[PDB]
Design a binder for this molecule. Structure first.
Ligand SMILES: [Zn+2]
Ligand SMILES: [Zn+2]
Ligand SMILES: [Zn+2]
Lengths: 380, 54, 66, 38, 604
DNA sequence: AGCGCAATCAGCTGTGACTACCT
DNA sequence: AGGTAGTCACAGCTGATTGCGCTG
């Protein structure tokens, strides 16, 4: 039988009257039921992650001049890559991005593997005006990525993302041997095609554990990149995976004190123009080297300079707040004022924390579970 | 008949050049009335233009 | 010298008034002097009939929803 | 012609709904179309 | 009743106030329902009002409905009874139901199931449970012509008699006047006389919840009845027909307006019904895919109602087709049913259930009311605003931008009146510049543009000036197909011109920009159809009119259907950057030269 | 220079509004 | 002084004619 060939639904039978006017009570119940439309979690997916050393390979062949994506594939690809780099560094604190451009059967390492987003964005903007010629070489790009990532620590997840526009690749040697070597090296390879499905990309993605997708339009391209942003699930505990990193305090210099010492920034020292000789900035806790941008690994002593708030922003996932016990107002024989907003409790349901047994209204409960991520009573 | 009709109007439509009629008022000699009034009568459409001359 | 009311309007309405002058829709040639592409000189004794005609033209191609 | 362009632009761009809206402006994004936002 | 301010005041008629503002509803004595959308019970009130009344306007804040006899017939067709509808109407009134609505509802809903019309063995019989009503209608002279051979009485069991097949429309027209409306209920669950086919829709064609409501209202209590479902072109309309055909599980007949809609319906059936091509046939005198002995037959109008000599193969196909019963004769583009030759199409074939599908039910000559008895009551009317709120219908930003008439054109417009002024405001140089600017701006951002333009004489010089493809309309079959095919999957060309050809349901690809110039007079149907070619601010459609011309009144009176649907037409007076770039007719010389060619028609 | 597919014209009809004549 | 059937524009369909192509 069919669902719609039976009896027609009467959704208006829910409302009923006993005292001629209880519709106000019904609409109050409906308004209360309208709230709490979430699961008390902003993400609700992967609550953790792992250090990812991701390499992004961009096709630089003549096929990038095609106008499937306005204005051409290269410009849309680089714009979406800038967006992807920004989002990936936003959602991954201690990750690194490398960019490889393959052209004329050779692969050029456009950018070193590091955690600076500004350098990658500047490199992409510079590469916007590149010359699209020749044919891509997946073998050379994968060889460069494997050579770079072979010496990386085992606990980090090694990933390669390939943007393959051209349907043909030139390999100076057998590629399936390289795929076997990558599989033995536990390097994940993901490919996002632009024209159509290529067998070698499917085999590579299946064997290395990655995913192979083909772009339908620019929105689908952005969706695939956004999916690639998310970190992979992390095993319980592998080994002593740790890392020596510093937390450079942003100590600026004021001439009101006698210790106002101007210093050139190491990052700005490599620029053609005059480096910024500002009063202060981020001083390395180990060698007192000065940097302006974070997170940037120290050039001198090799220490990783990260920002503590960036690491702390993900701490609420480790310790989620347990849902408060929903209690009807009549059954709660205690105070009738919310502990968070001091407002009078007039809702039919009152939420009580399991730890401190305090009183929270619906709005304060939603705010605590969604945004605050901490019980105000438990803090005291 | 159709193939001669579709071409007989090509030359007919290209003969006429001006459609709007020129309506310039060509007033004749002025007539002097009382109180220094002067009236001009159009010789093409009979338009009367009465004016006071300083 | 001429005495009357100067009318300032869009060029389309100036052409409409010029057409009304020659069409004798008012009974006479009271649209006497044209001075500018957007300005005309009209006798003041029957400025109301021009208002009525313009209003009729305006609400003719309006389709009031009443 | 040089003057013909100016005359035609003056006639077309400001015929009915400009000789009064501009006067009001002198005396005084969601719903805007894409060509009106550039 | 009183006209102190010219308004019908009914303050004293409905003074009941138990709850101040609990009930989001208003009633009127004659008949009308006002609904408050900003209410927590909005969905329940909408579900109640859709099943009992048809809408008249659905703006963003206060929905307004109307109570009609056919709406109450449809409501009582479903399991809803008089007591339930009355008690739930008084449940949400906030003012008290006037004692002019209760009596009207009682009178309408009491006489619904008294008279039935049934089809059996290619014979039409009218059966009534109450024997008295037969004698009550026996005295009607018009009914006596239907009964052939003295109608001895057909004593069975319940009193019924035969009626003439070719005069079924007349008796349906008379019955509503006799306060005894006829119903067309087909209980396809238990027939055992019809060779039910093995059609079965694939379990991968998911449908939206709004289509679920329409389908459920179609089969209220396990039976299928004739009705009309109104869904937008971008929305799923053919899917509803395919699902209904699969559920009825009988010999289906599909009727279209054009000879290209039959291929569209065949493709839809092949996509969402899992039917072999042997059973599927197209009857449009183009391929002749053996329509004899078929499960689902797809044909078109203007062929089943020929008044002239018919082809031998077509004559044999019609002879075969007029000799068996049909289950769920689907009619597409139901708005053009009340025609001189299309009304007889329903009476020339015999079918149990008649389903009408359309997107624009509006029509002039007030013949839509005739469709209430020609087919059935308006079953479903989609709420376009809430449909585009769900994101499944493109949120089109409607624009009504007018262009002033040039002085060289307005003199000729006001000088002539004998139908020669159509080309004057159509070929307005300012409107030409506006259209060119819009085309260029939306091409600079890679937007697909469909430019509708009636009065193909103007379109000829409108399209060659921009050097863009156009469809004159009687060009060919192949050229139009290839142009529409290369319009979508080609970045070089993304704008086409259509002349009254796209004023129906075709397979036009997804488009974002529609620019119509010089449409028909006051056809709300044409404007609604043209809007439907865009939805599928994701998109926006423009209408260009010439000020101080009849096109202004035409545009005003042709948008009242869309504003009732909830669309707002913003008025655009100035186009930004009009003088920034170069446009055609820049100087007065070519503008005044255009007068010579636009006056050169002289079709006298 | 015999068949056969395809382009083409005739006849009827739908949609919408404009217009001449007379009780 | 007022209203309905011709009539024009533009599109559709089906029913025939009638005119160009038809093998390594
Ligand atoms: Zn350091
Ligand atoms: Zn609170
Ligand atoms: Zn707590």
């Amino acid at each position: 039988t069919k669902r719609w060939e039976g009896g027609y639904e009467r959704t208006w039978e829910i409302l009923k009257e006993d005292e001629s006017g209880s519709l106000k009570a019904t609409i109050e119940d409906i308004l209360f039921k309208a709230k709490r439309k979430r699961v008390f979690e902003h993400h609700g997916q992967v609550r953790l992650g792992m250090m990812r050393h991701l390499y992004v390979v961009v096709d630089g062949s003549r096929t990038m001049e095609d106008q499937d994506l306005k204005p051409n594939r290269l410009t849309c690809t680089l714009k979406l890559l800038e967006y992807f780099v920004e989002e990936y560094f936003d959602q991954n604190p201690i990750s690194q991005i490398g960019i490889i451009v393959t052209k004329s059967k050779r692969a050029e390492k456009l950018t070193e593997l590091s955690g600076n987003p500004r350098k990658h964005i500047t490199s992409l903007k510079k590469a916007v005006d590149m010359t699209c010629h020749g044919e891509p070489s997946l073998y050379n790009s994968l060889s460069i990525a494997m050579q770079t990532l072979k010496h990386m620590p085992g606990h980090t997840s090694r990933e390669v993302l390939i943007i393959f526009s051209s349907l043909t690749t030139c390999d100076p040697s057998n590629i399936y041997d390289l795929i076997k070597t990558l599989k033995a090296a536990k390097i994940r390879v993901s490919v996002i095609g632009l024209s159509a499905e290529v067998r070698v990309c499917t085999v590579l993605a299946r064997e290395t554990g990655g995913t192979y997708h083909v772009i339908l339009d620019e929105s689908h391209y952005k969706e695939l990149l956004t999916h690639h942003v998310s970190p992979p699930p992390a095993s319980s505990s592998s080994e002593c995976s740790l890392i020596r990193m510093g937390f450079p305090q942003h100590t600026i210099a004021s001439l009101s004190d006698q210790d106002a010492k101007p210093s050139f920034s190491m990052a700005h020292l490599d620029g053609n123009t005059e480096p910024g000789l500002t009063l202060g900035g981020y001083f390395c806790p180990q060698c007192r080297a000065k940097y302006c941008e974070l997170p940037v690994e120290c050039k001198i002593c090799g220490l990783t300079l990260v920002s503590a708030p960036h690491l702390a922003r993900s701490y609420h996932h480790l310790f989620p707040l347990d849902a408060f016990q929903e209690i009807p107002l009549e059954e709660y024989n205690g105070e009738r004022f919310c502990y968070g907003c001091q407002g009078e409790l007039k809702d039919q349901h009152v939420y009580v924390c399991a730890v401190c047994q305090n009183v929270f209204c619906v709005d304060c409960d939603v705010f605590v579970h969604d945004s605050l991520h901490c019980c105000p009573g438990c803090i005291h | 008949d159709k193939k001669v009709k579709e071409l007989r109007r090509a030359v007919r439509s290209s003969v006429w050049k001006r459609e709007t009629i020129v309506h310039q008022h060509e007033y004749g000699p002025e007539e002097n009335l009382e109180d220094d009034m002067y009236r001009k009568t159009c010789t093409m459409c009979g338009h009367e233009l009465t004016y006071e001359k300083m | 010298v001429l005495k009357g009311v100067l009318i300032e309007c869009d060029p389309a309405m100036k052409q409409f008034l010029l057409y009304l002058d020659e069409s004798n829709a008012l009974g006479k040639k009271f649209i006497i002097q044209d001075i500018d592409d957007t300005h005309v000189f009209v006798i003041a004794e029957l400025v109301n009939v021009l208002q009525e005609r313009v209003g009729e033209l305006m609400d003719q191609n309006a389709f009031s929803l009443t | 012609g040089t003057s013909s362009q100016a005359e035609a632009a003056r006639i077309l761009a400001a015929s009915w709904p400009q000789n009064r809206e501009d006067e009001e402006k002198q005396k005084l994004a969601s719903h805007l179309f894409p060509f009106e936002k550039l | 009743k009183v006209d102190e301010y010219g308004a019908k005041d009914y303050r004293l008629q409905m003074p009941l106030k138990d709850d101040h503002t609990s009930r989001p509803l208003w009633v009127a004595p004659d008949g009308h329902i006002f609904l408050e959308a900003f209410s927590p019970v909005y969905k329940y009130a909408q579900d109640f009002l859709v099943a009992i009344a048809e809408p008249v306007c659905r703006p963003t804040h206060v929905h307004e409905y109307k109570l009609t006899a056919y709406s109450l017939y449809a409501a009582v067709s479903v399991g809803l009874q008089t007591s339930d509808i009355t008690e739930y109407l008084r449940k949400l009134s906030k003012t008290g139901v006037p004692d002019g609505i209760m009596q009207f509802i009682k009178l309408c809903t009491v006489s619904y199931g008294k008279v039935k019309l049934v089809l059996k063995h290619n014979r039409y019989f009218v059966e009534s449970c109450h024997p008295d009503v037969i004698q009550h209608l026996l005295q009607d002279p018009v009914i006596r012509e239907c009964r052939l051979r003295n109608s001895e009485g057909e004593a069975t069991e319940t009193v019924s008699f035969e009626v003439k097949q070719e005069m079924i429309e007349e008796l349906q027209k008379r019955c509503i006047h006799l306060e005894y409306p006829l119903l067309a209920e087909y209980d396809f669950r238990n027939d055992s006389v019809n060779p039910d086919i093995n059609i079965d829709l694939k379990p991968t064609a998911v449908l939206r919840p709004y289509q679920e409501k329409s389908l459920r209202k179609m089969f209220g209590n396990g039976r299928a009845r004739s009705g009309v479902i109104v869904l937008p072109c971008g929305a799923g309309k053919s899917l509803v027909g395919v699902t209904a055909a699969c559920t009825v599980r009988k010999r289906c007949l599909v009727l279209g307006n054009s000879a290209v809609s039959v291929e569209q319906w065949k493709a839809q059936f092949k996509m969402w019904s899992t039917i072999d091509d042997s059973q599927i046939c197209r009857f449009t005198s183009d391929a002749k895919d053996k329509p004899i002995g078929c499960s689902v037959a797809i044909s078109t109008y203007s062929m089943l109602g020929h008044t002239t000599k018919r082809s031998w193969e077509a004559e044999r196909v019609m002879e075969w087709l007029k000799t068996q019963e049909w289950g769920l004769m689907i009619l597409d583009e139901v708005h053009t049913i009340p025609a001189k030759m299309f009304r007889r199409v329903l009476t020339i074939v015999q079918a149990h259930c008649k389903l009408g599908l359309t997107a624009t039910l509006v029509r002039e000559d007030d013949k839509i009311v005739d469709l209430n008895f020609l087919i059935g009551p308006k079953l479903y009317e989609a709420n376009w605003m809430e449909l585009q709120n769900n994101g499944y219908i493109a949120k089109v930003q409607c624009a009504e931008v007018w262009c002033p008439m040039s002085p060289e054109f307005y003199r000729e417009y006001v000088a002539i009146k004998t139908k020669k002024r159509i080309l004057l405001y159509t070929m307005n140089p300012n409107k030409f510049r506006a259209c060119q600017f819009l085309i260029k701006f939306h091409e600079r951002r890679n937007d697909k543009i469909i430019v509708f333009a009636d009065n193909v004489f103007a379109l000829k010089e409108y399209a060659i000036r921009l050097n863009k493809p156009y469809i004159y309309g009687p060009t060919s079959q192949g050229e139009r197909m290839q142009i529409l095919q290369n319009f979508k999957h080609n970045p070089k060309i993304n704008t086409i011109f259509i002349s009254k050809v796209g004023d129906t349901s075709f397979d036009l690809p997804e488009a974002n920009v529609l620019i119509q110039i010089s449409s028909h007079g006051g056809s709300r149907r044409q404007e609604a159809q043209r809007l439907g070619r865009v939805l599928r601010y994701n998109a926006f459609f423009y209408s260009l009119v010439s000020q101080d011309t009849q096109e202004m009144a035409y545009s005003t009176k042709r948008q009242r259907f869309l504003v009732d649907q909830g669309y707002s037409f913003k008025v655009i007076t100035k186009l930004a950057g009009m003088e920034e770039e170069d446009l055609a007719f820049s100087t007065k010389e070519e503008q005044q030269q255009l007068l010579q060619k636009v006056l050169a028609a002289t079709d006298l």
